[PDB]
A paper describes a structure:
As part of our structural genomics effort in targeting novel protein families, we determined crystal structures of three bacterial proteins from a previously structurally uncharacterized protein family Pfam PF08000 [also known as domain of unknown function family 1696 (DUF1696)],11 which appears to be involved in the bacterial cell envelope stress response. These structures share a common domain that is surprisingly similar to the eukaryotic PH-like domains, thus providing the first direct evidence for the existence of PH-like domains in prokaryotes. PHb1 and PHb2 share a common domain that is structurally similar to eukaryotic PH domains, which we have defined as a PHb domain (PH domain in bacteria). The PHb proteins form oligomeric ring assemblies of different sizes and symmetries, providing an excellent example of how molecular architecture can evolve, where the general form of the molecular assembly is preserved, but its size is expandable.
Structure determination of full-length (sa) was enabled using reductive methylation of the protein prior to crystallization. The two PHb1s are closely related (80% sequence identity); PHb1(sa) can be aligned to PHb1(sl) without gaps except for an extra glycine at its C-terminus. The PHb1(sa) model consists of 585 protein residues, 2 polyethylene glycol (PEG) fragments, 6 glycerols, and 242 waters, and PHb2 has 1106 residues and 173 waters. The N-terminal residues, which were deleted in the PHb1(sl) construct, are ordered in two monomers (A and B) of PHb1(sa) due to crystal contacts and form a short helix (α-1, residues 5–11). The conformation of the N-terminal region differs significantly between PHb1(sa) and PHb1(sl). These structural variations, which likely reflect differences in the contact environments in the crystals, demonstrate the inherent flexibility of the PHb domains. The PHb domains in two PHb1 orthologs contain a structurally conserved core, except for the N-termini (before α0), the L34 loop, and the L56 loop regions that are highly variable in conformation. The 10 copies of the PHb1 monomers [from the two pentamers of PHb1(sl) and PHb1(sa)] can be superimposed with an average rmsd of 1.31 Å for 94 aligned Cα atoms; the rmsd values between different monomers are significantly higher if all variable regions were included.
Numbering used by the authors:
A (entry chain E): 15 to 125
B (entry chain B): 2 to 125
C (entry chain A): 1 to 125
D (entry chain C): 14 to 125
E (entry chain D): 13 to 125
Write the structure that this text describes.
Amino acid sequence: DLGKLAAELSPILGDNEELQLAYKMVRDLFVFTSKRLILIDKQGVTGKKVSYHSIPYKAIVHFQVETAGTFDMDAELKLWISGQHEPLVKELKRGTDVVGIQKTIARYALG
Amino acid sequence: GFLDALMGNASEVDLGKLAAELSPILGDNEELQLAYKMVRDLFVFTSKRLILIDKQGVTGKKVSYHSIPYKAIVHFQVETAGTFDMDAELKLWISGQHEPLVKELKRGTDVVGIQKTIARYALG
Amino acid sequence: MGFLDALMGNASEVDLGKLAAELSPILGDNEELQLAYKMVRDLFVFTSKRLILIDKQGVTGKKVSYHSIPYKAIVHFQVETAGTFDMDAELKLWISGQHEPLVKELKRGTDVVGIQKTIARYALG
Amino acid sequence: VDLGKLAAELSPILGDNEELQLAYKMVRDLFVFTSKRLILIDKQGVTGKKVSYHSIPYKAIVHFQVETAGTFDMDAELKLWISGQHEPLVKELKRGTDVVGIQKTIARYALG
Amino acid sequence: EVDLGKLAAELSPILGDNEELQLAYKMVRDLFVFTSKRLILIDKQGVTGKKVSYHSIPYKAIVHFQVETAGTFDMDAELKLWISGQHEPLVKELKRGTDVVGIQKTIARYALG
């Protein structure tokens, strides 16, 4: 829900920045603004910590979706961030918008 | 129709069929433009990125769609023995990465078309 | 204003006039200080051209470090809940060429929300 | 180097609107400067079985160095640091190589 | 050797067409020469000075930089300059009595514009 979300995030958004799309991942929230991808996660030994990882779109230097199998396929998203050897890795679970998120990442990363 | 491909212009890949199939993961502002076959795999050139589509595993049932934005291709290289027996190799270096993406270009692959096409999009 | 907005701003406030007078020998003639945040152990100085991150370093804390970070060098950044009681925050700034982030403590009571907004403003924009 | 001949021989991998401008031939390396990139062609050494064709757009050349090398510092060594790398591309410019020319040409293309 | 004219005589053949020498600083082991297009580090080594390197750093390749004060009297203030495409920073002692503040201002003028 973009409304509860804009209300929560607004104090750390730029003045002209706007929330445009959001996707619920397994443990993550993928928040697409006009300027950056914000990954909102639950960290810690339990789940008390919260992280907001701001990724400007020009920092997404390559990305990949890999599926395994024919029926009931596994799908995994990899997003490589400039300067990082390891990619961010996200399961595209039996519950995630597999195609939408790829189209959105493409839309923002390619411009 | 490989001979049809040779004999002038005709892409060896069915570009129309490929566009229909990839449509759900392409941007509304994005067009499929050219594609080359590397054995069972594909080098797909859109108006915005190179998409490497590789079938992996014994069955070829594990498929990766690896997208490289043209603006992120920093430099590139083909190492080749021409028509001596050996295969060629492509290296693509990507912005803010350290190691290149490495792809074998098996003998018979249109390595010259791939190179010229990369130059077209990576310079632009 | 919110009940604590005024105080949080004063808590990490620095006199820019005094700071400009002292930093001016190393600033470009076309450079102005715009904002500054005095956090727990670091002074974040936002100029029109770079973040100058100032802190004490050395084996016995006798050195002073002036780290100039042009805004174009900030590749990505993260803020996370920090501290045993989960009151504070930890900022990670990834600078171009460095695979490890600069890690900085931000304490509740200071302008933690403000500094995140400022980083977003300059790095994005 | 006959530039007209080289331009025709490289034409299959050049853009239609790309001009070959200058070329420098070393022992195992051929530095080709086009309007759009340096194509560094390395035909390798005595155990070589392939040729490397390395296209380096000028904007990827982030800094560079020439240093004296060899016995009595009569040869030179070129280092080209390229965007995204940790370590440079290293090439030997033996005495008799156009060391000053190559340096000036890189300055003209890589500065901006 | 910080005479800009002598540095021009030495560097002329490798300079671009409308490139001018503007400032030069003597460091402990090299020279930082600021041209209108690049920082050129000149290191002439040995007793005979035969081993020479010219390291050209376009100003856009200066990613970030840091100056740390000495702290104690047996140490120098230190400059680190991180350059694109090179993992390790360039590290240079800023010796007492030299233009320690000036070189920082110069780096900021050229790198930041």
